[PDB]
Design a protein around this ligand. Structure first.
Ligand SMILES: O=P(O)(O)O[C@H]1[C@H](OP(=O)(O)O)[C@@H](OP(=O)(O)O)[C@H](OP(=O)(O)O)[C@@H](OP(=O)(O)O)[C@H]1OP(=O)(O)O
Ligand SMILES: *P(=O)(O)OC[C@H]1O[C@@H](n2cnc3c(N)ncnc32)[C@H](O)[C@@H]1O
Lengths: 76, 988, 291, 76
């Protein structure tokens, strides 16, 4: 199933994944599609900073909600 | 070294340069314009001993070439060397100057010349020059040989430093520092630079290394490098060393360079010229051939060619043809070059002389110090573009008329001089550039026509001790006087016909009222001497509003640039961007310094906040509220007050005497230099690690360290004295100088304890305590508000700032800085030298002639220079750019649309008029920074039915205003198309 | 309930207000406290024109794109004649230590805009007495990568063509306000889940909670700013009961760690400060009239 | 094709380009080695300033050609 996710440039990514997509598999897939390292990929949604191990359905929320990201916090 | 007169020079050169140029002897021969200007430049440099020489006498023709001669000198027929020795002696008391008139010929003994170290020759016959070069080069050590000559619009320059010359610094650019990320124990070793920050280096350069973990053997060693990637390179074998742990700093190491020269005679057969215009690389060889042919003709006929004498032209052409085949390269012959040289062989041109003199003085500096790479080995400057646009002028216009301007008429003719005498030029700024501006203009006799021709200068600045180093127009008895008035008084001596207006105004939008557009249109050309880009942009916008020619230039150190703008031909000054100083996050500045400049900036900001912001806030607070009991009641009633906590804390901590201020300084030192490190280490232990396990306190971060006080440390005592005197000055507490003695301060601190390291009610209690102590008097609510002064030696600003910066470096294990560098960085002082400014002044004065000529777009040039190489470039300026919008409508930067309206004129009327006249509807209207109609913001829709006189609220003195308009993009969601400037008149 | 909250307040997201009055001499008379006196008064160059077009385009987006929700909402006021004088207030996200807060900012547009990122500062600093978030300096300094430029990483910095004001608003409202700002400091996320890190997080969160209870509500209501006055009166009026409920929950949670010894005394001090704040806060809410 | 970019102060930069490249891409290549933004740099060839929107073939730039990088100054 596909998804909506937006970024700094606002790309609303829409790509098919699995219902048990573990967030480490999500990091792998993100580095497949873009090659960006998972260390910058601190995915956040529904008030939860995503931890790798559990699957997509392990959180009980499902697809199509526009998700977004936070960087590793660099200081001012 | 008296810093008050050589502060900029020290930063340009360095102490070794001043030490070497001390105890130096230079011989110069020929009291022409070139000799005079080189002499003034070197005296401004400040050589201990210089000897001039000349055997000729004053002439009426010498008036147009010498700016220190007088009509009395010509009347008395004095030797040219004698009559100027006094004036040049006035420039520097620390410079000893000697004059000589010993006859020189083939039989003259040259053994006496060994006293000097360098030789400068001008207006000398060629074979004698060759003989002198041979004698100088045969010396052990050889004496530097320098020669330059000018004929009309032609200049020749040659250099010879012997078989081998040594350079102690090729470029003069400070080496950079990097951070080591990874190193491989490989043969050859591979070094990985930190993330980003490409090294920008080159293969073969040497770096020294330090604080490398694992390979302690690589610390203190110098390795020649081999660039591999933008972020990596190679070093020697490292397999025999320990594994790399972390850390490491590499800095480039400069290397002395050896160069070589040749004899004059050998270089004549194949000169090693330098190219300044890549458009015609073949021109310099032809120019050298023409100069050699001219020398041959002059030797043969003992005379210069006559203007209009075609036989002289063909004879010179035949001589050049004979010479060209003889050359090693065997070049071709440029007939027009020969014709023009023959036509104007007897003229003299001032700005070319000035530029040649500046570059020659710089090369003499290179010879005496070896601090820069010398020029090798030839140079030829020329300004034929001015005469190229003349078509076919007659020789009669060049004929002399028996005046001081005979040479200039022989150069360009009488007509251009007549156009020159009628120019109304405006000058802004009166720095070092403005003085030589005025000197050159006096030499040109600009504006001397009684009916027309005017010069205006405005500068609010006064005369300062350091200004005399660069500004020769001013004397030590002129200190604290308007620059404009003193400069005008100095310049009017040379020529009585000068019509000059001098003002103390600073150009700015607020003063624009005196500078109305009628005044701008009255002027014909404007020259800039500004030091800041904001005023530059403002002046650009002013001149563009009048379609007026403008000239701009700028110099730092050994670099300089010139720019030319012409109405309807080129782009604006604002058409290009300038790189501003980069920003530093406090994440660095406040907490994680990595360089001495960070500590310098932090100390400067702390000083500013403490001694400027805080007293002003306190006085504003206590002038807003008259009574302190009133404030106490308002606090007790729960009312909020702005900045109340800070002011009450300051007042409760108000010292009353000298000892209290001393204790305050001591505790401030304790807090600043001891407790901060303790708190930071408490929040972050030295062993704290990151997610990867890498140390948080890794590069570029440096761990701090608390410092224990010691009065016996001179730095600590100096900083304490600075802090105490600043506190006493701020709090209006008088004191005696004997209190600053170390013994008295020790007596004060011998009973001083220090607290160890670890709201509204307390503030109210302190306020009540102050009230019951009668500490709320009117005098108590006051202290002096201070301003930074880097030019005062006794105020202690620099002393305190340097001490604080050194300490802040110290606890962070950073190398401190001396007083001079700290002062230069804090004041952001711009280094400069007389040679560069003189050369760029000559260049801009020369280009002014082309500006006057009204020549086509191809005649003008812009030049950028860096004599440290040395390097000079000449390029054609940017052409004007076209901007189309829609429906085939296009415009330029010079286009301006105009619409006349009425008193009942409305916004819909304006839209209808503009759309009718130009086919496009203005989608928005804004007057400068205040909007007039934006449909997005609610309520601007009702603005369409308003009187435009009402909506604008203009000033009566102006009958028109200029507004900004835009237009809807063809595709919605795109940025609106910008509109050309529109000038609206309130009435016809 | 939340439907009514969003419905009533949608008309007040974007609006305008008059702050500067110019006399006959061109002097700038500011009617309210603004952090940028000197910059506005001194920088009088009108050479910039592309900034006007850029802000005209921005006004279209910012008039409709303002986030508005029960958790957090955006409301902005700007000068009715100038363009570089900004003011904005945000409502604290639900369940955060800054829950249902109200904080003000002052934003100045540089002349060289959009070639440079604008300026921004806090306004509810408590007289600079409170440092709220690692990314929030107590004096009021605001630091954002999209609002600054250095060597660093290219895409993150201020991009004149792509970086937008609304993006800055979103970055602030989202990244600055998080559930656990204690681990915002890099190097502390190494100790996530550890009992010591958890205890330090609890203590820091209690500190933040008591500080925001003191300043973000009581001080705001007692001496409101003229600009966002009616807006805050309406917003705080509706959320009184939930504010009381979360205050009681916080106080009950604060009481749980008073038995500790490592953090017990400071924890109880935070409890006492919170109770003292709530004592007057309840009275103030009971005195609040219906808008 | 190989070209050299000599800036003032003697620093020499090596570049790889092919004809048909656009001046703006050529100058953006400079940033990868110097960090100088494209809008801040002026480059000169054969006494002419290279305008934006053109290609190297228009200016007739060939192998081992030399381009200069220049800047304006502020002091006075
Ligand atoms: O007002 P500032 O010039 O910005 O300096 C202040 C000031 O220090 P000084 O009085 O020594 O200049 C604060 O002290 P108070 O007068 O407010 O008590 C101090 O706060 P602390 O005493 O609580 O340490 C603060 O430091 P910080 O912001 O780290 O708390 C420090 O700021 P700077 O030293 O960075 O200017
Ligand atoms: P350099 O710093 O040697 O000399 C510059 C001089 O120009 C004057 N100046 C700077 N800025 C202005 C404006 N805006 N208007 C008029 N004059 C200006 C400085 O005072 C120096 O004298």
């Amino acid at each position: 199933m596909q998804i909506f996710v937006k970024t700094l440039t606002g790309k609303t990514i829409t790509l098919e994944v699995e219902p048990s997509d573990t967030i480490e598999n999500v990091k792998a897939k993100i580095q497949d599609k873009e090659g960006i390292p998972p260390d910058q990929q601190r995915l956040i949604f529904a008030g939860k900073q995503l931890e790798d191990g559990r699957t997509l359905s392990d959180y009980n929320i499902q697809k199509e909600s526009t998700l977004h990201l936070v960087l590793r916090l660099r200081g001012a | 070294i008296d810093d008050a007169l050589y502060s900029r020079q020290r930063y340009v050169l360095g102490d070794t340069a001043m030490q070497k140029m001390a105890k130096s002897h230079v011989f110069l021969s020929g009291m022409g314009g070139l000799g005079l200007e080189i002499a003034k430049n070197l005296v401004l440099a400040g050589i201990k001993a210089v000897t001039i020489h000349d055997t000729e006498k004053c002439q009426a023709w010498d008036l147009g070439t010498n700016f220190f001669l007088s009509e009395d000198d010509v009347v008395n027929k004095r030797n040219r060397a004698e009559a100027v020795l006094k004036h040049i002696a006035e420039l520097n008391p620390y410079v000893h100057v000697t004059s000589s008139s010993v006859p020189f010929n083939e039989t003259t003994d040259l053994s006496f010349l060994d006293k000097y170290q360098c030789v400068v020759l001008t207006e000398m016959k060629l074979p004698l020059q060759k003989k002198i070069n041979d004698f100088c080069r045969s010396q052990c050590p050889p004496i530097k040989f320098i020669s330059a000559d000018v004929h009309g619009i032609w200049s020749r320059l040659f250099c010879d430093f012997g078989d081998e010359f040594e350079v102690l610094d090729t470029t003069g650019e400070e080496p950079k520092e990097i951070f080591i990320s990874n190193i491989t124990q490989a043969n050859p070793g591979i070094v990985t630079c930190l993330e980003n920050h490409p090294h920008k280096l080159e293969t073969g350069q040497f770096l020294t290394f330090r604080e490398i973990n694992g390979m302690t053997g690589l610390n203190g060693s110098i390795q020649q490098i081999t660039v591999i990637s933008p972020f990596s390179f190679s070093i020697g074998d490292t397999t025999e060393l320990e594994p790399y742990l972390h850390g490491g700093i590499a800095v480039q190491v400069k290397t002395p360079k050896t160069v070589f020269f040749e004899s004059l005679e050998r270089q004549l057969k194949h000169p090693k010229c330098l190219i300044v215009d890549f458009s015609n690389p073949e021109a310099p060889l032809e120019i050298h051939t023409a100069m050699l042919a001219l020398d041959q003709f002059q030797e043969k006929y003992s005379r210069k060619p006559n203007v209009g004498c075609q036989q002289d032209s063909e004879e010179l052409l035949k001589l050049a043809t004979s010479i060209s085949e003889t050359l090693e390269e065997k070049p071709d012959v440029n007939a027009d070059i020969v014709h023009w040289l023959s036509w104007t062989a007897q003229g003299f041109l001032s700005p070319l002389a000035a530029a040649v003199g500046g570059v020659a003085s710089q090369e003499v500096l290179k010879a005496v110090t070896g601090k820069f790479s010398p020029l090798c080995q030839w140079l030829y400057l020329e300004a034929a573009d001015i005469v190229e646009s003349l078509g076919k002028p007659e020789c009669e216009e060049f004929l002399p008329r028996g005046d001081r301007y005979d040479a200039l008429r022989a150069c360009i003719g009488d007509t251009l001089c007549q156009k020159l005498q009628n120019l109304n030029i405006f000058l802004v700024g009166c720095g070092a550039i403005g003085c030589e501006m005025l000197k050159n203009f006096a030499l040109l006799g600009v504006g001397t026509s009684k009916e027309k021709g005017m010069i205006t200068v405005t500068d609010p600045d006064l005369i300062e001790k350091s200004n005399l180093n660069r500004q020769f127009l001013f004397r030590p008895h002129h200190i604290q006087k308007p620059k404009s008035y003193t400069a005008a008084d100095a310049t009017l001596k040379i020529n009585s016909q000068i019509k000059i207006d001098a003002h103390l105004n600073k150009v700015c939008p607020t003063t624009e009222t005196i500078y109305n557009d009628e005044f701008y249109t009255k002027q014909d050309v404007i020259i800039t001497a500004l030091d800041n880009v904001e005023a530059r942009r403002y002046v650009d916008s002013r001149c563009l509003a009048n379609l007026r020619p403008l000239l701009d230039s700028g110099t730092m150190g050994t670099k300089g640039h010139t720019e030319v703008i012409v109405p309807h031909l080129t782009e604006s000054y604002n058409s290009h961007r300038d790189p501003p100083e980069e920003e530093i996050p406090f994440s660095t500045l406040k907490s994680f310094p990595a360089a001495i400049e960070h500590t310098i900036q932090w100390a400067r900001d702390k000083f500013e906040s403490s001694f400027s912001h805080k007293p002003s806030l306190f006085n504003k607070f206590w002038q807003t509220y008259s009574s302190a009991e009133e404030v106490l009641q308002k606090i007790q009633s729960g009312h909020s007050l702005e900045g109340c906590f800070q002011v009450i804390k300051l007042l409760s901590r108000r010292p009353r005497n000298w000892s209290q201020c001393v204790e305050l300084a001591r505790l401030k030192f304790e807090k600043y230099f001891n407790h901060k490190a303790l708190q930071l280490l408490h929040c972050f232990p030295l062993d704290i690690r990151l997610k990867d396990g890498s140390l948080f306190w890794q590069s570029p971060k440096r761990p701090p360290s608390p410092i224990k006080f010691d009065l016996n440390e001179p730095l600590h005592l100096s900083f304490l004295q600075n802090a105490a005197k600043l506190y006493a000055t701020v709090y209006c507490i008088p004191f005696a100088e004997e209190d600053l003695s170390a013994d008295a301060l020790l007596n004060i601190l011998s009973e001083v304890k220090i607290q160890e390291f670890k709201d509204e009610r307390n503030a109210i209690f302190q306020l009540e305590k102050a009230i019951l102590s009668n500490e709320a008097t009117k005098s108590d609510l006051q202290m002096a508000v201070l301003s930074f002064e880097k030019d005062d030696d006794h105020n202690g600003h620099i002393d305190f700032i340097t001490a604080a910066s050194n300490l802040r470096a110290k606890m962070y294990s950073i190398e401190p800085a001396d007083r001079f560098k700290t002062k230069r960085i804090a004041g952001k002082i711009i280094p400069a030298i007389a040679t560069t400014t003189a050369t760029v002044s000559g260049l801009v004065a020369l280009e002014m002639i082309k500006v006057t000529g009204g020549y086509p777009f191809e005649a003008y040039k812009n030049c950028f220079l860096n004599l440290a190489i040395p390097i000079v470039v000449f390029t054609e300026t940017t052409e004007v750019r076209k901007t189309k919008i829609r429906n085939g409508i296009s415009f330029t930067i010079w286009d301006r649309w105009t619409v006349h309206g009425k008193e009942d004129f409305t916004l819909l009327d304006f839209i209808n008029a503009v759309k009718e006249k130009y086919g496009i509807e203005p989608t928005m209207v804004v007057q400068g920074v205040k909007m007039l109609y934006v449909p997005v913001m609610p309520g601007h829709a009702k603005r369409l039915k308003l009187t435009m006189h009402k909506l604008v609220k203009p000033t009566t003195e102006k009958k028109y205003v200029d507004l900004t308009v835009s237009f809807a993009p063809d595709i919605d969601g795109d940025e609106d198309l910008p509109g050309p400037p529109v000038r609206y008149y309130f009435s016809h | 309930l939340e439907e009514k909250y969003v419905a009533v307040m949608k008309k007040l997201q974007f609006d305008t207000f008059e702050m500067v009055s110019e006399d006959e001499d061109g002097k700038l008379g500011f009617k309210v406290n603004y952090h940028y006196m000197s910059q506005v008064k001194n920088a009088n160059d009108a050479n910039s024109a592309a900034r006007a077009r850029r802000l005209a385009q921005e006004a279209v987006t910012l008039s409709t794109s303002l986030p508005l929700s029960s958790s957090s909402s955006v409301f902005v006021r700007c000068d009715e004649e100038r363009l570089d004088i900004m003011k904005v207030l945000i409502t604290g996200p639900a369940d955060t230590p800054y829950a249902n807060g109200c904080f003000e900012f002052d934003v100045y547009f540089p002349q060289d805009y959009p070639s440079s990122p604008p300026l921004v500062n806090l306004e509810t600093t408590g007289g600079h007495s409170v440092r709220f978030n690692p990314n929030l300096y107590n004096d009021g300094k605001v630091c954002l990568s999209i609002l600054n430029t250095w060597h660093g990483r290219p895409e993150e910095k201020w991009n004149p063509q792509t970086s937008s004001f609304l993006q800055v608003l979103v970055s602030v409202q989202s990244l600055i306000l998080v559930a656990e700002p204690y681990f915002n400091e890099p190097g502390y996320e190494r100790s996530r889940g550890t009992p010591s890190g958890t205890q330090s997080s609890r203590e820091y969160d209690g500190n933040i909670r008591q500080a925001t209870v003191k300043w973000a509500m009581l001080e705001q209501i007692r001496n409101p700013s003229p600009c966002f006055k009616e807006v805050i009166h309406k917003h705080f009026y509706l959320k009184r009961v939930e504010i009381m409920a979360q205050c009681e929950e916080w106080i009950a949670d604060i009481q749980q760690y008073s038995s500790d010894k490592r953090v017990g005394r400071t924890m109880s001090h935070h409890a006492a400060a919170l109770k003292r704040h709530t004592a007057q806060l309840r009275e103030e809410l009971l005195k609040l009239p219906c808008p």
